[PDB]
Amino acid sequence: RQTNQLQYLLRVVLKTLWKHQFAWPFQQPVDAVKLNLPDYYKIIKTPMDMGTIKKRLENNYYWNAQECIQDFNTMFTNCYIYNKPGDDIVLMAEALEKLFLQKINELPT
């Protein structure tokens, strides 16, 4: 049994983002070896993705809403830091982040 906010972050926020057309690059960790990105783990000290966030939500890892929001923010900023600002992945990230922020301000008290 989790707090109302955490429940909403899983059943509303994560689930809406997961079903989005641009969720696919964000549903699993970046496999930097398979994708030939030798400096990825050197630049990204804390990889994060929606698949990892989901499991944490489902496992009661998070103490409260803000910790989950922190993970989401890390996922987005990792993408902006690593890629070039015109890359497709970055415009997908921006799109997904605006919806996220949208659903976050809709969060219950």
Ligand SMILES: COc1ccc(S(=O)(=O)N2CCN(C)CC2)cc1NC(=O)c1[nH]c(C)c2c1CCCCC2=O
């Ligand atoms: C060619 O890309 C892929 C090929 C296959 C796969 S995948 O997991 O094998 N899978 C996705 C789900 N689909 C159903 C099956 C294929 C992922 C990816 N890539 C990503 O995810 C991804 N995500 C980020 C955030 C970045 C990247 C790579 C871009 C630069 C680093 C970067 O920032």
